[PDB]
Amino acid sequence: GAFLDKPKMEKHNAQGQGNGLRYGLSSMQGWRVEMEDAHTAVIGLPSGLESWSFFAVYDGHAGSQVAKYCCEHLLDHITNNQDFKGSAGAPSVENVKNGIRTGFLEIDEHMRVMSEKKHGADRSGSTAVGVLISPQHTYFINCGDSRGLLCRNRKVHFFTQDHKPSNPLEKERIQNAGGSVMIQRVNGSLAVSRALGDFDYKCVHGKGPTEQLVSPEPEVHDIERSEEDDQFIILACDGIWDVMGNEELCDFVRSRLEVTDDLEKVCNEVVDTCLYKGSRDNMSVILICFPNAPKVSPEAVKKEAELDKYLECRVEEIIKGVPDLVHVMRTLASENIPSLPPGGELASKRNVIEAVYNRLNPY
C-alpha cells in the first residue's frame, strides 16, 4: 500500500468520430504506484450493429487483470449471448437490458473458471461504467462506484447511482450472505458492493451469483435519444468524482468545450483539474459529444486569453523573498479572482499559473 513521491502526470489519450459522434479520452496514473484503470471506446460494432457505439471505464482494484480482461471482452460477452439476440429482428429494449445482465454474469463466471483452471494468483476486481449507444437510445450501464452522466439541454439529464455497501439494498444483500457493512466497507475491507472479479467475495454456499457479498449484476437505464437536446456524456472512475460533483463537472466541461473542439485536451483538463483539487487516485475520463454539443465561441476564447494573461501578470507581480508555487497559489486563492472556469476554479488554471512561475523562477 503506497503512493509515489511525485505524481505520474503522463496522459494516455484516444479519439474518434463516426455515427454522428465525437469522442475523446484521457487516462493518468497520478499519485498511485500502479495504473489499474482500463477503458473501451469503439464506434461501429460487429454482427450488424455498425450504427451502434460502445464506451466504458473500468476501475480495477488489487491489480488490473479483471479490468484489462473486461476492457477487451465485455462488449462481445454482452452482444454475443442469446438474450441480446432473443427476438428475430433488431434487438429490443428488453433484449438489450437482459443481454447486458447475461454478458456481465457470464464474463464474471468465465473469469472464475479461467482463474481456477490456470491457478491464478491475483485477487483483483473491477468496476464497470459505460453507455451502449443505438441510433435511438443511450443505454447507461453501471456496476460499482465509477459513474457516468448525460448532459442534455445544458443540464444534468441523468447520472448513474454508485453501488456503495451502505446503500439500503446492498446492505440487505451483504447481510443475507452472512457479512456486514462496517462504516462504508464490506466486512470492513471492500469499498464497493458491486464488481466483476473479487471471487473471494463470491464464495457464499447456496446463494445465487447475484446474492453474494459482491454482486456482478449491472444496472441498466434506457434513455431515449434526443437529436436536438443531447449534448455530451461523461464517464469516469471515482478518481474524478471524489473531488468534483455532477453539476460542477458538467458546467466545467461545457466551459472547456466553448474554447476547444479538441476533446483529448478537454479530458486532460478534467484529469489535471482533479489531481490539483486533491485527487490521489488513478483517473480516467471519456467524453462523447453529440452534434448539439457546446460549440467553440469567439468570446469565450478571448475571455480565456484575457484570464491567462491576467494570471501571468499576477504571478510576476507577486514574486515582487521568492515564494514557492504553493505560496503563490495561496496568495492567488486569497485574491478571490472572478471569471475562473465554473467547477474547475483555480485548480483548472494551475497549468497556466505554473508555466508562468517556471518562466520567472526556473531554478
Query: Cα separations (Å) of 253 from 106, 118, 265?
Result: 36, 44, 11
Distance in Å, CB of 59 to Mn ion, minimum: 4
Cβ distance to Mn ion smaller for residue 264 or 281: 281
Distance in Å, CB of 238 to Mn ion, minimum: 4
> What are the cell numbers at 235?
464517464
CA distance 69 to 230: 31
Q: Binding residue per annotation — 60?
A: yes
Q: Binding residue per annotation — 281?
A: yes
Distance in Å, CB of 129 to Mn ion, minimum: 12
Cβ distance to Mn ion smaller for residue 152 or 277: 277
Instruction: Give the 3-state secondary structure of the chain.
Output: CCEEEEEECCCEEEEEEECCEEEEEEEECEEECCCCEEEEEEEEECCCEEEEEEEEEEEEECCCHHHHHHHHHHHHHHHCCCCCCCCCCCCCHHHHHHHHHHHHHHHHHHHHHHHHHCCCCCCCEECEEEEEEECCEEEEEEECCCEEEEEECCEEEEECCCCCCCCHHHHHHHHHCCCCEECCEECCCECCCECEECHHHCCCCCCCHHHCCCECCCEEEEEECCCCCEEEEEEECHHHHCCCCHHHHHHHHHHHHCCCCCHHHHHHHHHHHHHCCCCCCCEEEEEEECCCCCCCCHHHHHHHHHHHHHHHHHHHHHCCCCCCHHHHHHHHHHCCCCCCCCCCCHHHHHHHHHHHHHHHCCC
List residues near Mn ion by CB under 5 A: 36, 59-60, 237-239, 281
Distance in Å, CB of 128 to Mn ion, minimum: 12
Cβ distance to Mn ion smaller for residue 58 or 252: 58
Cβ distance to Mn ion smaller for residue 191 or 204: 191
Cβ distance to Mn ion smaller for residue 241 or 357: 241
Cβ distance to Mn ion smaller for residue 24 or 60: 60
Q: Binding residue per annotation — 229?
A: no
Breaks (C-N over 2.5 A) in the chain follow: 320
Q: Binding residue per annotation — 108?
A: no
Determine whether 105 is exposed, middle or buried from the number of CB atoms within 10 Å of its CB (0-12, 13-18, 19+). Answer: buried
Distance in Å, CB of 237 to Mn ion, minimum: 5
Distance in Å, CB of 221 to Mn ion, minimum: 22
Cβ distance to Mn ion smaller for residue 43 or 285: 285
Cβ distance to Mn ion smaller for residue 55 or 241: 241
Distance in Å, CB of 135 to Mn ion, minimum: 33
Distance in Å, CB of 60 to Mn ion, minimum: 5
**Which residues define the annotated binding site for Mn(2+)?**
59-60, 238, 281
Q: Residue positions in the annotated binding site?
A: 59-60, 238, 281
